[PDB]
A paper describes a structure:
In order to elucidate the conformational changes that underlie the transition to the sensitized C1 state, we introduced the K169A mutation into the hTRPV3 carrying the previously reported functionally silent T96A mutation (TRPV3K169A in future references). We expressed and purified the TRPV3K169A channel and solved its structure by single particle 3D cryo-electron microscopy (cryo-EM). By contrast, the K169A mutation induces a substantial change in the secondary structure and the position of the distal CTD as well as the ARD-CTD interface. Specifically, the distal CTD undergoes a dramatic coil-to-helix transition and this newly formed helical distal CTD is positioned behind the βCD in the cytoplasmic vestibule of the channel. Furthermore, the cryo-EM map of the TRPV3K169A contains a protein density that abuts the proximal CTD and the CD and occupies a similar space to that vacated by the distal CTD upon coil-to-helix transition. Instead, the density appears to be connected to the N-terminal of the neighboring protomer to which connectivity is visible at low contours of the map. Since this density is not sufficiently resolved to allow for unambiguous model building, we built this putative N-terminal region as a polyalanine chain. The coil-to-helix transition in the distal CTD and the rearrangement of the putative N-terminal region in the TRPV3K169A are accompanied by an apparent anti-clockwise rotation of the ARD when viewed from the extracellular space. Notably, while the distal CTD of TRPV3K169A does not contribute to the front side of the interface with minimal interaction with the CD of its own protomer, it forms extensive interactions with the loop of AR5 of the neighboring subunit at the back side of the interface.
Residue numbers in the entry:
A (entry chain A), B (entry chain B): 1 to 14, 110 to 149, 154 to 462, 480 to 508, 518 to 750
The structure:
């Protein structure tokens, strides 16, 4: 993004009292920029003090540029010089000699996109730590926020976000030692929060890249910071949206850092009070270990699982899922109730569709008896589908179920009244029904991944082929109809293509191979007709070959691999939907939580799982000696 | 697997004589756990001795927890501390001062899943060797077995198996020096055997991973152990199942360790008495070398080859086969009798089927003459097939042969009686016959691997396509039959689809391309009919394209590679089946064994083979200088 302008060496635009004033001020700024002839700065400072001697507010105004609110020290810090430390010392000494130092160093850069900015921000972004400690020691407020536009962007591509504090900036950026200095300082605040309210930790999450980079600053800095300040009062806090930093890292597709946040095994006493993933009884490869689930068991307001699974703007959900508590929870919930209810609804729907088929085939008293309850199932499934359909590449099947039951109830209704078209609607219904059998191939891996591939092909690859095919079809169709304008001469069979749609249909038969390529009869110029038709055949062939080419390249190496992952995701989505489907009291009966006493005064929910890693253990054994 | 519970820091559950007793005992346990304030342990020990002074059985009971049978020393060993060696020394000194030391250190951890466990087990699993030598020196029984559940699991995924002894644990785990200490000790037993009876070596086999890992503890430990104790009395022994450690490693798919076990060239005198793969006359690349076959020539009760080949739960059989004695044996047996008998049975079966064909084509005296002997071949092949068919992805062809001959004898019988259907059965028979020609494409590599690919495709890829195809077919069929409910009006040809099966058949013709897509006649609403049918066509196309996609991905790089391996395996299976087919006396005539005199008192069977490795030799030549 391109926008309003900043301090730069090169301006983009192409009595002697006023002239002397301009010379002196601009020379001050230019000496700050070059930062070389500090004797020039000394003479200019002596002259400014002499002018003031022959008032401090006007002095600071002559020093502080009113255009962007930029001061000489800020410009000096921007233009990084070898002596720039010396220049900062000199200017600081002169400001002390003037004694307007408070309002000076507390200057907020005044601009539209920059409502506020300390010089310390620049000291840190520029990586000067010695100067940072000096200005901090000088009496610098380390708590003011860069509540601006460039710092708080709407989109990540346009703008730089770090946390709107010095400390968050030191953390996001490399500089750790400065973090130690700021933590040591007494007037420092950690629990201060930005405009959105995201604290330091939330800010850290907004920056850690995924993809398992070899060296990551955020994975370590978070650990150090949390180890220093021992508090559950830090991660318990929330942003504007009421989101925990855990939940925030989950919303975004941030993997390895999330893995860390969910397993913090640490030995010291207060650390143990802070720890997560409490371990016991480990013995060679085998190990029991228990986790905690205070915001993870799906009972919370906006739990972790609902955020991982119902979020489609990531595509990294599968990686997140393979973590311990999540995967174990899904497996447990499956084995407890999904393996029941899934087959249950499968059998209901199967009986339903068979009944529909038989009732459609024969168009007695027991026939009416079944036909009654079929309307009940139709109405029930329609009511269940509509709520999710109105409230919203996965939910297509829901719309399809809703369409089916809608059509069935409509057909039954028009049979209740005096209508003839009803049978038509009816049969279309049951046809759609059998397509929805694909919905239940999720029950099995071998059929499920196949159905996933089928749906992917039907959505991605065929439409581009079919659109261009139909436009060629229509163009050739009108062409050939124009050639076939010769009247039938008392025999419509002599005019095979007298109708446009008839010619279309024959071309489709041709593309299959059923038809009869007639020598052009009832045609004025038959050879042109024939050449044209041949051309159509050729273009269909090459178009087909092109989609067939383009198909193989999408399947480089990730066909089966993405298929299995997507199957697992689909199972997760269904399992969690059923988990919401149950009552509250049944969920009380299924709440898998186990308590624990890790602290003197902490009694939290927990999940005990066993882990068996022959391979990692054998590596551990081999490397140990 | 998740089950009953263990010693842990954190319990999962959420007069002053009794209170003082609880305080003292729990403080003893907690001091053992923390292992820091040894002065607290000293004061507690002084207080316990004072309480006992104002009896040793009650002392050990107050010390030994009766819940899980766990003692203070065991808990101390579990909680590993820096001073834990010092703590063990102190507690040991106090136990000596009490003099109940025997029953103390011989304590068996008493639990349901843990019938018994020494502290030394923990000393070793925890890797403390110094403490191990101390407790061993203290008078520790090193022979007691962990005859429990967790140590002896049914399934490998759930549980940890090592051999149920200290020594087996030291061996399976890294610790070699402890093995030297235990071997040096006089009261040590090597020939002691576990519940299953698998000794140390059998146990080692249960742990060595395959896949040729770069560093493997089992490959070396086995060598050292066997070199120390010079005995054929060790590998001659067997488990509960009567299996040798060789046979056990063969049953499992354990490759490189098996390669080692089958070739042990070693130079020292007693070692030579132990050695395998006796070498002579090696000279540059060329080398003669002879192996031994005391349990490998297929005459033993449960030989190596029968175990490699008739075992399907591995999939690593091909790798095992390329070893020297096996491969040479198979090649020799082939060249001696299989190249005969295979072509023999091929020609018999070929004459048989041709006779069947001709007799089926013409429905004289020589015709009856051939027809007589055909029944003989049918009965004979049926008898040979049924025994293997009843006694049981390879044996499908056997069932097919049995089906064929059964059908033939049935048809001949019903021709013997007064039946008309016989001809039908007859022809079906001969049809199946020609499919079984694939059975004999094993005779050649070029045709054999092709047939392997064909059978794989027919088993794996087409069924998933065809099931979903037929359900679409049936759904669309009932739909279209419902639309075609318009009566024929005196002309069944006007009702092309009046019958359900007829419409099915026409759709199949359509999917081929033979039929005639009729403009919908005898149809109430023809446009819906037409759209529906078009939809079916589209879905067939995309389904076909999907199986075609999924096909290419299964053939990443292992099509021809797995094909050739499977051909070689199939040859092996047939060759060995014929090897069993022969008489006992003929096998006596074909016994390839050659004797040898390696020892003063050893006269074993042997096989002399020559090995030619130009490449390995040239590498040897180049690296040597």
């Amino acid at each position: 993004x391109x926008x309003x302008x900043x301090x730069x060496x090169x301006x983009x635009x192409x009595e002697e009292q006023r002239r002397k004033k301009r010379r002196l001020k601009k020379r001050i700024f230019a000496a700050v920029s070059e930062g070389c002839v500090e004797e020039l700065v000394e003479l200019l400072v002596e002259l400014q003090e002499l002018c003031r001697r022959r008032v401090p507010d006007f002095l600071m105004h002559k020093l502080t540029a009113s255009d962007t609110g930029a001061t000489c020290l800020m410009k000096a810090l921007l233009n990084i010089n070898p002596n720039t430390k010396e220049i900062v010392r000199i200017l600081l000494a002169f400001a002390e000699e003037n004694d307007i130092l408070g309002r000076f160093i507390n200057a907020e850069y005044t601009e539209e996109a920059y409502e506020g900015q300390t010089a310390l921000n620049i000291a840190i972004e520029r990586r000067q730590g010695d100067i940072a400690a000096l200005l901090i020691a000088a009496g610098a407020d380390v708590n003011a926020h860069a509540k601006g536009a460039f710092f708080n962007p709407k989109y990540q591509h346009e703008g730089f976000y770090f946390g709107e504090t010095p400390l968050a900036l030191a953390a996001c950026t490399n500089q750790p030692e400065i973090v130690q200095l700021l933590m040591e300082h007494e007037q420092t605040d950690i629990t201060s929060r930005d405009s959105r309210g995201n604290n330091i930790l939330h800010a850290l999450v907004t920056v850690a890249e995924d993809f398992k980079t070899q060296n990551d600053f955020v994975k370590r800095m978070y650990d150090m910071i949390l180890l220093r300040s021992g508090n559950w009062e830090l991660e318990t806090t929330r942003n504007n949206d009421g989101l925990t930093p855990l939940q925030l890292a989950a919303k975004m597709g941030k993997a390895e850092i999330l893995k860390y946040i969910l397993s913090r095994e640490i030995k010291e006493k207060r650390l143990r009070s802070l720890s997560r993933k409490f371990t016991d009884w480990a013995y060679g490869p085998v190990s029991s270990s228990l986790y905690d689930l205070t915001n993870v068991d799906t009972t919370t307001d906006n739990s972790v699982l609902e955020i991982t699974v119902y979020n489609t703007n990531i595509d990294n959900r599968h990686e997140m899922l393979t973590l311990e508590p999540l995967h174990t929870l899904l497996h447990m919930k499956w084995k407890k109730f999904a393996k029941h209810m899934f087959f249950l609804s499968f059998c209901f729907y199967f009986f339903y569709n068979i009944t529909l088929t038989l009732v459609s085939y024969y168009r007695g008293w027991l026939q009416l008896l079944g036909r009654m309850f079929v309307l009940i199932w139709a109405m029930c499934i329609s009511v269940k589908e509509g709520i999710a359909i109105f409230l919203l590449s996965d939910a297509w099947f829901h719309f399809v179920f809703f369409i089916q039951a809608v059509l069935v109830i409509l057909s039954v209704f028009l049979y209740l009244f005096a209508y003839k078209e009803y049978l038509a609607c009816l049969v279309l219904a049951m046809a759609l029904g059998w397509a929805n059998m694909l919905y239940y191939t999720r029950g099995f891996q071998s059929m499920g991944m196949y159905s996933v591939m089928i749906q992917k092909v039907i959505l991605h690859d065929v439409l581009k082929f079919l659109f261009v095919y139909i436009v060629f079809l229509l163009g050739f169709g009108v062409a050939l109809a124009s050639l076939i304008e010769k009247c039938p001469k008392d025999n419509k069979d002599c005019s095979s293509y007298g109708s446009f749609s008839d010619a279309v249909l024959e071309l489709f038969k041709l593309t299959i191979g059923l038809g009869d390529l007639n020598i052009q009869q009832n045609s004025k110029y038959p050879i042109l007709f024939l050449f044209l038709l041949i051309t159509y055949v050729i273009l269909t062939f090459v178009l087909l070959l092109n989609m067939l080419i383009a198909l193989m390249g999408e399947t480089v190496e990730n066909v089966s691999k993405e298929s299995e992952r997507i199957w697992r995701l689909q199972r997760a989505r269904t399992i969690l939907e059923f988990e919401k489907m149950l009552p509250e009291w049944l969920r009380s009966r299924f709440r898998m939580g186990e308590l624990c006493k890790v602290a003197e005064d902490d009694f939290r929910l927990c999940l005990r799982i066993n882990e068996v890693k022959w391979t990692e253990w054998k590596t551990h054994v081999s490397f140990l000696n």
